[PDB]
Amino acid sequence: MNAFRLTVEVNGVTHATDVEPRRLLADFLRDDLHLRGTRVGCEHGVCGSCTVILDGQPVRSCTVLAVQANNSRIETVESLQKDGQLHPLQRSFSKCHALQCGFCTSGFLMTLKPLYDDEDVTLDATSAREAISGNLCRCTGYQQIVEATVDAFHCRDHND
Amino acid sequence: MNAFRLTVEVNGVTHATDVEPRRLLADFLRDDLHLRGTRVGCEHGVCGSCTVILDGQPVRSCTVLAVQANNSRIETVESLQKDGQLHPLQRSFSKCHALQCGFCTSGFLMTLKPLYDDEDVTLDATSAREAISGNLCRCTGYQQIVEATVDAFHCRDHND
Amino acid sequence: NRQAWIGQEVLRREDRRLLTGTATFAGDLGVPGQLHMRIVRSTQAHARIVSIDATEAEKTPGVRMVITSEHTRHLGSVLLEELGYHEIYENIEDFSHPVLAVDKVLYVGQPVVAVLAVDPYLAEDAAELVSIEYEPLPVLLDPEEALTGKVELFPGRGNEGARIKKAYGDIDRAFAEAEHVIRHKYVTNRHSGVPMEPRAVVVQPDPARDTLFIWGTVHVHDNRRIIAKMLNLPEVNVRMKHVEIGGSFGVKGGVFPENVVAAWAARTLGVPIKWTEDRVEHMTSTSHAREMVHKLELALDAEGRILGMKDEIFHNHGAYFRQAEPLVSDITAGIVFGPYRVPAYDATLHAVFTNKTPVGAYRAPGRYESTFARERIFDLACAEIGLSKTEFRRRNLLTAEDLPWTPGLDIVHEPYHFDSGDVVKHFNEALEAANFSEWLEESKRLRADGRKVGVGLGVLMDKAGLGLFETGGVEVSRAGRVTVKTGGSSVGQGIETVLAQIVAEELQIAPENIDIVHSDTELIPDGVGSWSSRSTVLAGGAARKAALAVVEKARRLASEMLEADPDDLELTAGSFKVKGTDQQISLYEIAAARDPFTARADNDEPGLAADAVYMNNAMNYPYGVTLVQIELDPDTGGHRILRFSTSTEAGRVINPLTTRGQIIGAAVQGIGGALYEEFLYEEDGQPITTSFMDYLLPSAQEMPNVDCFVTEDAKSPDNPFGAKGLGEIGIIAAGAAIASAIDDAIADGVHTDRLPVTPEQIFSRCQGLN
Amino acid sequence: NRQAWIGQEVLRREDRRLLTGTATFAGDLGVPGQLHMRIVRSTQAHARIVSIDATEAEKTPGVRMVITSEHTRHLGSVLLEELGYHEIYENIEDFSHPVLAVDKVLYVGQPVVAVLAVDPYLAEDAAELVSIEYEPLPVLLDPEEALTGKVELFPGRGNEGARIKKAYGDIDRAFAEAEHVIRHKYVTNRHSGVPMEPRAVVVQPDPARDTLFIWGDNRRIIAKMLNLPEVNVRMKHVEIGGSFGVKGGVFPENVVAAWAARTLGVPIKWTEDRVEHMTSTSHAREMVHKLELALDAEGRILGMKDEIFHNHGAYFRQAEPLVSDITAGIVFGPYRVPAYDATLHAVFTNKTPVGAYRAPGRYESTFARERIFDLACAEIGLSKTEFRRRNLLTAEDLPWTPGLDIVHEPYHFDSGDVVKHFNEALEAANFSEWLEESKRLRADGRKVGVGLGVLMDKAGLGLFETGGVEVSRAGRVTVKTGGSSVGQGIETVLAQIVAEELQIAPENIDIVHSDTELIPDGVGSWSSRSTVLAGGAARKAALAVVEKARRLASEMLEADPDDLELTAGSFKVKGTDQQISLYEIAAARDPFTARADNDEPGLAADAVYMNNAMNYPYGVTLVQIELDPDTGGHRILRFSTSTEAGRVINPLTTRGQIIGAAVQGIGGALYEEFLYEEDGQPITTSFMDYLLPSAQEMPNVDCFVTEDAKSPDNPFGAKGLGEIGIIAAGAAIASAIDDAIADGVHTDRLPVTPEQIFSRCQGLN
Ligand SMILES: Nc1ccn([C@@H]2O[C@H](COP(=O)(O)OP(=O)(O)OC[C@H]3Oc4nc5nc(N)nc(O)c5nc4C(S)=C3S)[C@@H](O)[C@H]2O)c(=O)n1
Ligand SMILES: Nc1ccn([C@@H]2O[C@H](COP(=O)(O)OP(=O)(O)OC[C@H]3Oc4nc5nc(N)nc(O)c5nc4C(S)=C3S)[C@@H](O)[C@H]2O)c(=O)n1
Ligand code: FES
Ligand code: FES
Ligand code: FES
Ligand code: FES
Ligand SMILES: [Mo]
Ligand SMILES: [Mo]
C-alpha cells in the first residue's frame, strides 16, 4: 500500500532502498545493511546499546522510524575502527576491562564518540560518570568504564 | 529498469511478487521460492533436469523468462509426494535404482508426470526410451530408468 | 626464559569481537526462508481455557501457520530436567507449561499459542488477532499460603513442591541450654538477572532429516540432550552451533518452551525458524528468583558463641520447575550457615508454587537470600547480648584449628556428599586483614551528622562439580596458532582468556597465538557447561592435562625427530633446545611434520570411563566480607553510598584485571537487588513491573565511585592449581551489609526485614523527629 | 539366522533425499549478505597481458569489488598438488591459475579476474565491461610438437613436463629372439566427465576472530595457502551430482572464494556456467601411444615397449602426475608380459588442465593394447579371441610379481596378481558369444569385438580411511565416514556392512560424511577405493561397539556369562529368557562416567588401513554393432561387459555403476571429443557440440556378468568396481567396427565419426 525510498548515508556508504514506514531504524541498520554492531536490549529508549550517531548527535536507533532518517549521516560502532587500528576509545575500553559481555559497548562507545572528537572537555571521574549515564550495563558496573573513558582522554590531550 | 508485477500459482500456492523481466523462471523458482528441487545443468534446453510442468505441459524452466509464466500454473518435483507418501513414479524410481547423483531426477520425473496421469499409453521399453529421451543422465545408462518407468506403468494399469 | 602467564593481567581475547562488532549474537542471525515466531502469552494469572479461534490469524496473509497446544502436547513430552534427581518425588510437575497445554494457565506471560510469519512485524500483527476466552480461577501469590493449600494449582495436586530437610546431632539440647534464643522471620525480594541481551533462538533444519542446526543460545549448549530426548531424534543430528551471549547470570540457564516449539516446528516444516524476545516478555517469561521467606532461630550463651541455628524457609519457585529443579533450593537449605561455627541445625525448606514466572537460578542462587537472613539475625542478636557485631563475628567465625571442618549443620549434602570439605583455610585473617585493609574503624569514627556503616560475610557453594568431569582439548598447528576446545561457555566473564593463559603457561606460547573454541557440539560432542563459579579448575583443569599431553606427545616425539634422548637444556620457547646451545625444533614444525605420516599431532585426553577431568565429592568454598557506609537524606527518601568494599579470599586469582570485573560488577548487581529491583504483582495477578521504566536497574551516577577489592592467595585448595570460583562472590553479602548500614544510620533497633529498601520505608525518620 | 545384509539388493538410502527435493546441492545454498562471484576468464589460448583496471566494472552500482592478480598473488602462492611422492622433479611450473595470472595466459578458460556483485546477473553484467589487453603468442596443441621445441609454455628452463620410465627383464634380446614384431601409433580422445551439476562453491566467514565455512577433506591446501589453520576448516556436507574424478580437488575458484570471504567478512557464492565447465575443468583421455610388440611363432608375448605422450593440458592439477605415473605402469593389463620399456611424457599445451576422469589412464592404455593385439591377430592371422586365451595370465604362476619396473603403481611396493584366475572368467563370461558370431547371413550387421580390463582400483589411497559408529537412545545408529557420497551409493554400502555386523536393519542406519568439524580427518573417494577401505573402517568400529556391549552389557545384568546367542538386535541371555536391547545399553551410559560408542579407526599407529592394497579386478567387454554403409550411422545391437570382483556388496547398485560406466565409455568411443581451432580456441563448449549419450542411441541391453571368484586378502575379500564398466568400451567398439567392413583392425584415432565410416565405397572403388 505504501513503500518509502530511503536515501541515507551510513558509516560513509550511501544507501538507496525501499522500506515500509513502520520498520524502526535499529531493524533497518541490521537488515539489510548487515551492520549487526548496533544492538537492541530494551525497547523504549533505555538500554543504551541501541544508540547510534545521527547527524553528529547520539540518538536511539529504536525510538526513530528508519524512515525519519532520510537524507542524513548515520554512524555505528563499525565506523570507529580505521584500518585494523581500533579507535583509541576501543583500546582503553580493553586496556581497562570496560566490557565483559559486549552488549553495552556499541551504546557507550557511540555516546562517547562525538564527545571525544570535539576538543573539549576533559573527562574526570565525576564528569565521566554523567556522560555515560545515558547507558545501562549489568556487568561492570561502570567503575572500569568510568576508568576507561578517563584514560582515553588523557592519551588524547595531556599525552606525555 | 522497471520491475514487473508477477502473479503465479506454484504447486497450488499462489504468489505475488515484483521481478525484473530478465530473470529466468528456473532462478525464480529456486529464488526466492526456495524449491531447489528444480535443478540446472546445461544452459540451453538440453540437460533435462531443468524441466518443469508449465500449465500441464512439460517445458524447460531455463528457456523461459520468469515473467512469461504470469497467471499460469506451475508444478515441480516438490509437488509429487503427498502426505509423506512418494508418488508412484518416485517409488518405482527407487525400486529400480533409476538415479545416482540426483540431478537428472526432477527433469525425468516431471517429463513423465502428465504422461502418467493421463490414461494412455502403456510404456514399453522401446516407447519408454523415446519418452525420457528429452532428458540426459550421466550415471545410470538409462537402462534402469527405462526399467523404472515401465514398472511404474504396470502397477498403474494391469495392476495384479 | 620461563615466561609466566597465570596470575598476570592480560587484556581479554574476546574484546575485539565485541568492540568492532564482528561477533554474532543469536538475534543477529539470518537464514534465507526464515519464519518468525511470535508467541501469544497469557493475560490471566490462573485460568483454564477454550481457545479455538486463530481463524482470522490463520487468514491474514504472510502467516504460514499458527501452533496451538494440540500440535505440541504430542511428542511433545514435557520439559525434562536432568540428574541431581534421586528422585523424591516427583517431577511432573512442573516442568513449565511445559509446552502450551490446551487446558490451564498458571501465570501471566506463559506461552499458549505460537504464530509463524514471514517477518516479525507481521508475526505479532497476527498474534493480536488470536482470541482465547478464559475462566479466571483464584490466584495464589504468598509462598506461606501456598502450602496451607486451598486454591490448588495442579488438579492432580500434586503437593506444592519438595520438602528438603537437614539437621545435625543434638540441637534440642543446644537450644534448651541457651540463654539468648532469638526468633525472627525475613523476606527477600523477587528479582532476577535481567541481562541486556534478551533470549533469542534460531533453528535451521537440514530437511535431509539427518540433522538440525541450533544457533539458539540454550545455556548449556550441550543440553541438546533435553531437546533430543523430547523430540525423539537424538543425539547428534541435533548439532549445536556457537554464538556469543550478552550476559545470562544463570537466568538464561537451560531449556525453555520457546526452544522446543521452534525446534519442533523447524523439523516438521523443513523451514528455518527465528525467535527474538520482547523485553516485556523477558520480564514475564524468563526465569525469576530471589523470593524467599526466612524464619530463623539462634542459640547463644553469655559468651556470644553459636550453639544452635535455624528454622523453615519458603522458596517461591513461581508456577513451575524450569531446569530449576530443587538444585538451588537444595543448595539454599545446605548453606544458610555460611562460614561459621554452628554445632547444630534444622533446615525445613518448602520449595512452593505460585502464579508467577517460573524461578530459575540467578547469580549466586539461594546464597544471596540466605547470607542476608543469617547476617540479619546475627546483627539483631548483638542488640540484646549488647556488644559489637564486629567482635561477635570475630571470635565465633570458623575455628581453624578445626580444619578440616566437616560441619556443623547437616547431614551435609550440598548438593551431594560428603562435605563441607572445608580443607581450605583461615576463616578469620580474611576478616581481620580485610579491616586492616584498612578503614573500617576509621569511619566508625564518624562525627556522623551524616550517616553510618555495615558488614556481612559470604561463603560460597561455587564449584558445583559436576562431577566428575569437564572436557578440554589443545591443538598445535602448521600456522603458528594454537586451538583450544572446551565444554565451557563465554557468557562474557573471560573464559576464553583465562584458559588461554593456563595453556600459555604450560606450553610456553603467548596467549595471543591461542584461540579458544566452545559450545559447538560437532567439535565438542560432550561438555558440562558454565554455572556455579566453576569453569576454571574444571575446564582449565582440562586444558592443563591436554597441554600436558602434548608436551609428552611432542617432547617424546621431538627426541625421535632429532636423535637426542628426552634430556637437553630446559625446554621452552615454545620450542626445543637440547644441550646449550646448538640447534632447535619449534613446537609448530613438530606438528606440521606429523601430517599423513601414519599419524596425528594432537591431544584430547579428558576423559574416559573413570572420567577426566576429575573433580568429585568436595568443592571449594570461597568466603568474603562486604563493608559499606551510606548517607541518607531524611527530608526525602534519598541516599548516597559513600563507601563500598567487597573483599574475598580465593586462592590463585588467574586474571586479576578480569576478576576485578567479576567482583565489582557482581557487587553492583547486589546493590540493585538491595535497593532498586523488585517484581511487583498486582493483588489480582497481573505483573506491574514489565517495562524498564518500572523495574529499576542501577545506573552510572548512583554507584560507588569505587568498590575496593581485597583478595589474598593464602591457603590454596588442593585441586591443582589450588584455585577457587569467584564469579559470584560479589553479590553474596551485598544485601545484608547495606541493610545493617541503613539500620545503623537511622538509628532504630536494627530491625529491617524486607528487601529492597524503598524511599517510602526510609522516611520512618519523620517519625523519629516527631 | 539372522539373515544377511551384505551381498543383498537393498534399496539405497540416498534416494529419498533426491526424489523429494529435500536434497541440498552447493548451488541451492543461499546466505544473507551474499556476494555473487563471476570470473572473467581467458579468451586467448596463449598470451602475455597489459590488463585494464575497470573502473567501468567497479563503477556499475551493485559491484562491491573486483579481484585482480594484484590481490591473490600475494598470496597465496600457486595451487599445491598433493602427497607426497612424485616430488622427484620440481614443479611449479604448475599448478593451475595460480591463483590469477597477470604474466602469461595458457588456455582459453583460465581465470584472470574475479568480480563480486549483489546478484549473479550484475556480476556477469560488469564482468563484460572489464577489458584485458593481450599479446598473442605461438599456440601449442600437439603433444609431440610440445617436447621438440620450439614453442614453450614456462619460458624459463622448465619446460614441458615430467618423464616417467619403467623397465626390467631383457626387452631387446626378447625382441631379437622373436620372429614376428609389431608396431603402431595410436591416438586417443580428449574427454572429461561432464557431469550434470556444474562446479559450485559457497563460503561463509565467521568474521569474528575465527574461521571459514565451505560447501562444495582437501581443506588441507586452502588452509595452508591462506595460512589459516589449525583448521579453522570448516568443510560442510553437501550432496554432489557427479564427480567422475573431474571435480577433483582444489581449483583456483576454490581459493579465490576463501581469500575474498576471509578478507571481507562477507558470504561469497560461486556457481559455474556450463560454458565455463567445458573450458575450465579437468580434461583427460588425450594420449599418444607408440607400441612395439614381440612374438614367438606360438604367439605368446615376449615383451611390450614404447612411448606415450599425455596431453596434460596447460597445468598440473590432480592428478599430479599420479595419472601419468599410473598409465606408464599398466599399459600391459592382465597378461604374460616378460619385459618392457614403457617411457611416458607428461606434456603441456594450451588447453584446459587435466584431472582424473573415471579410470584415468586405463581407457587410454586399454585401447592401445587391445588394438595392437587385434593387429597381431591380423598379421599372424591367428584368431583374435584365442590369442588372448593363449596368452593372458599364468593360471598356476600366481602370485605374479610383474616384469619391468613393477609394480611401482604409483609406488611402494608389491603387488602382483593374486586376485583370482583370469581366463575361466573370459571362458565362463562367454554366455551368448559364439552364437553372436553367426553373421552376416550376408547382410549389413558386420561387427564383433573384444576388450579387456585390469584396473589399479585400490590405489591405496591409502594408507587408510577413517570411520566411526554411534548407537544412541532413539532407535538409530549414526555412521561417520571419511568417504564422500558422489552418487555411487556409498552411504548405502556402509549401511549394509554395518547392519550385518550390528544385527540391525539398514533402515535404521544413518550415514554422515564430509562434515569436517565432525570428521577431523579422512581421505576422499578416489580410484575405486572406499568400500574395502572406508568399509573396513565401518566394520572395525562396528566390531568395537559390539565388544563394548557384549562385554560391558555383560555387567549390566548377570553374568559373564559368557554366552550362547550373540545377537538378534539385543542379547537374550543363557537361553531365551529375556534381555537388554542394544539401544538400552547406549541409553544408560552417558552422564554416568562415560560415553556410549566408538570411532576405532584409528590411533597413532593408524586404522583402518588396508595398506598398499593391491586388489586388481578384471574382465571383458563384448560388442556387436550394426553399421549403415553410407550413412555411417550405427546401431549397437548387443553389448555385454564382464567383471570378476571380490564379494560384490550390493548387486543392484553395482549394476548401476557397471552399466553407467560403460555408457560413458561408449560415449567416449563414438560421441565425445573436445575440439579446438588452429588458434587454440575451444569449439565444443555448449552441449550441442559436445554430444553426451541419450536414451535412444544406447543399447537397451547391458548384461551384468559378475563373478565372485577368489577373494583378495582384505576382509570379506572385495574389489573396486566403479571404474571397470568404462575401461574396455574403447577397444571393443574399434575392433568391432574394423571387423565390420572389414579390411582389418587399422583404426587408431578415436572417436569413430560417421565421416570416418566413409570407408563405405572406398570398400568398392
Ligand atoms: N576472568 C575470570 C573469569 C572467571 N573466573 C572464575 O573462574 C570461573 C570461570 O567462570 P565460570 O565457570 O563461567 O563461572 P560461572 O559458570 O558461575 O559463570 C560466571 C559467573 O559470573 C558471571 N559473569 C558474567 N559476566 C558477564 N559479562 N556476563 C554474564 O552473563 C556473566 N554471568 C556470570 C555467571 S552466571 C556466573 S555465576 C568462575 O568460577 C569465575 O569465578 C576468574 O577467576 N577469572
Ligand atoms: N553401490 C556400490 C558402489 C560402489 N561400489 C564399489 O566400492 C567402492 C566405493 O565407491 P568409491 O570408493 O566412491 O569409488 P570411487 O571413489 O572410485 O568412486 C566411484 C567410481 O564410480 C563413480 N560412480 C558415480 N556415480 C554417480 N552417480 N555419480 C558420480 O559422480 C560417480 N563418480 C564415480 C567415480 S569418481 C568413481 S571413480 C568403489 O570402488 C566402487 O567400485 C560397490 O561395490 N557398490
Ligand atoms: S532499545 Fe532502543 S534505546 Fe534501548
Ligand atoms: S552488559 Fe553484560 S557485560 Fe556490560
Ligand atoms: S538447463 Fe535449462 S533446459 Fe536443460
Ligand atoms: S546420477 Fe548423475 S545424472 Fe543420473
Ligand atoms: Mo550463574
Ligand atoms: Mo573417480
From Swiss-Prot, chains A, B:
It comes from the Bacteria. The keyword Repressor does not apply. Coiled coil: none annotated. Its EC number is 1.5.99.14. One of its GO terms (molecular function) is metal ion binding. Heterohexamer of 2 alpha (kdhA), 2 beta (kdhB) and 2 gamma (kdhC) subunit. Dimer of heterotrimers. This is 6-hydroxypseudooxynicotine dehydrogenase complex subunit beta. The lineage of its organism: Bacteria, Bacillati, Actinomycetota, Actinomycetes, Micrococcales.
From Swiss-Prot, chain D:
It catalyses: 6-hydroxypseudooxynicotine + A + H2O = 2,6-dihydroxypseudooxynicotine + AH2. SUPFAM superfamilies: CO dehydrogenase molybdoprotein N-domain-like, Molybdenum cofactor-binding domain. Its EC number is 1.5.99.14. One of its GO terms (molecular function) is iron ion binding. The lineage of its organism: Bacteria, Bacillati, Actinomycetota, Actinomycetes, Micrococcales. It comes from Paenarthrobacter nicotinovorans (Arthrobacter nicotinovorans). One of its GO terms (biological process) is nicotine catabolic process. It is an enzyme of class 1 (oxidoreductase). Its cofactor is Mo-molybdopterin cytosine dinucleotide. Pathway: Alkaloid degradation; nicotine degradation. This is 6-hydroxypseudooxynicotine dehydrogenase complex subunit gamma. Pfam families: Ald_Xan_dh_C, MoCoBD_1, MoCoBD_2. Molybdo-flavoprotein enzyme complex involved in nicotine degradation. The subunit gamma (large subunit) contains the substrate-binding sites, the subunit alpha (medium subunit) binds FAD and the subunit beta (small subunit) has a 2Fe-2S ferredoxin-type domain which binds 2 2Fe-2S clusters. Binds 1 Mo-molybdopterin cytosine dinucleotide (Mo-MCD) per subunit. SMART domains: Ald_Xan_dh_C. Gene3D superfamilies: Aldehyde oxidase/xanthine dehydrogenase, a/b hammerhead, Aldehyde oxidase/xanthine dehydrogenase, molybdopterin binding domain. Heterohexamer of 2 alpha (kdhA), 2 beta (kdhB) and 2 gamma (kdhC) subunit. Dimer of heterotrimers. It comes from the Bacteria. Keywords: Metal-binding, Molybdenum, Oxidoreductase, Plasmid.
